[PDB]
Design a protein around this ligand. Structure first.
Ligand SMILES: [Zn+2]
Ligand SMILES: [Zn+2]
Lengths: 259, 258
């Protein structure tokens, strides 16, 4: 894997269809606490205790307490230089008829806030809700999402469970529904949206340059996508903190690389 | 990027927990047809066209014809010298207090024919069915899987679609179900069973030595497994059609696992 910026910039100049696969490193550079490894903890629990349809069935109040916490910490965050370079490149290239798409594992909408428009959110968004009754997906940025969760969601073990009755958790506001809302987030056991994967696969089939940013291509989810682009002879440029590999924060490398 | 067999054996002789990741190259050496790449076609299509939820929903007869073909060709296939050496290595190290486990996305079951017991078939089996109604998972080696597939599944293009009505495709035989069966195999766009991957990770986290044999860069998720073993500092030896050993796995593996 080459570290030549000049050699990368030569493909970048000529690339008509760029696919940027964006991992958690991009979000972390904005102060988003990465909910994986040593960080994958809230009170007594891990992600596999919280982010599952079975968890939501047994204790939706606890799952909503956690996602309220997640929403609260996320909504105070701002796009970083990497997010900005990525958006500015899409805007700039688009005026020339050249394409940039972002595939993100992240659910904080920081790419959207930076100005990214060709955005594929494979894990959904925690600022979207899904109704478990009618199936309607809705935007929700409200703080707090419901009055019962006001002041709730503290991460300390020993914090009392809110034990909010289901009726008082976030409810659908479609006329005549009133169903229980869940976060519009892909949980363990649940498949990624087939329509999204369809769009993703089309982009990978047509791209002439691929970027992996804030993650590596040997790890989920970039490991799903980058190998088949590379096997086609399309250059894959990797930007992370340890064909092309560029070391350092994406906020440092991407502004220059995507200039 | 070592190519020394002498250095591998030193690690092999003492190794307690051996994971063997077995890719499509191991199957190809037994003549099992592959369905990626230029030589990977059934009629007009490759696996990426047929092994999908969408394809099954749109033409279950064509998808079933494809897997029926693959089920039927296995009758002339045998495990190769690679499968045997892997299976003999397992039983041998067993009576020494040592672990050999095989993790594979191969669905042709030649590893278990060869005598492998610690086998993780993480992509299911050609010889297993799943009911799309009741979810029951059943072993199925019946030839043909249903009478409507008798003589069907021809691999050359221009072969007329069987166009078997869904009612005459493989049907669940659980009392009062009658649901449509699919092959119990992981498709493009589908995740692994949650427990399956949790078990893979357990083997990967505890192994002293990893073998990766006949595995392409695009096989998924299996291509992630050796990378995370190496990240631990644990030696990974590549056997293609840290160590690299070139040639048929039936030629290199007997001497490597001797
Ligand atoms: Zn509703
Ligand atoms: Zn059934």
């Amino acid at each position: 894997p080459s570290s030549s910026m000049a050699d990368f910039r030569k493909f970048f100049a000529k690339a008509k269809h760029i696919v940027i696969i964006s991992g958690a490193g991009v979000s972390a550079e904005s102060g988003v606490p990465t909910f994986r490894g040593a960080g994958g903890y809230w009170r007594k629990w891990q992600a596999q205790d919280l982010a599952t349809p079975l968890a939501f069935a047994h204790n939706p109040s606890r799952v909503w307490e956690f996602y309220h916490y997640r929403r609260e910490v996320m909504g105070s965050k701002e796009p970083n230089a990497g997010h900005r370079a990525i958006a500015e490149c899409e805007t700039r290239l688009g005026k020339q008829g050249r394409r940039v798409v972002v595939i993100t594992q992240n659910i904080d909408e920081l790419h959207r806030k930076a100005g990214t428009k060709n955005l594929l959110e494979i894990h959904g968004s925690l600022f979207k809700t899904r109704c478990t009754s009618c199936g309607v997906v809705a935007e929700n940025y409200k703080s707090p999402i419901c009055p019962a969760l006001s002041g709730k969601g503290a991460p300390e073990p020993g914090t009392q469970d809110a034990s909010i009755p289901v009726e008082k958790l976030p409810r659908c506001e479609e006329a005549g529904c009133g169903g229980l809302l869940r976060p519009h987030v892909v949980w363990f056991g649940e498949n990624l949206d087939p329509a999204i994967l369809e769009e993703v696969d089309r982009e990978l089939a047509h791209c002439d340059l691929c970027l992996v940013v804030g993650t590596s291509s040997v790890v989920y989810p970039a490991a799903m996508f980058a190998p088949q682009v590379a096997a086609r002879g399309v250059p894959v440029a990797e930007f992370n903190t340890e064909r092309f590999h560029f070391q350092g924060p994406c906020g440092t490398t991407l502004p220059e690389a995507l200039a």
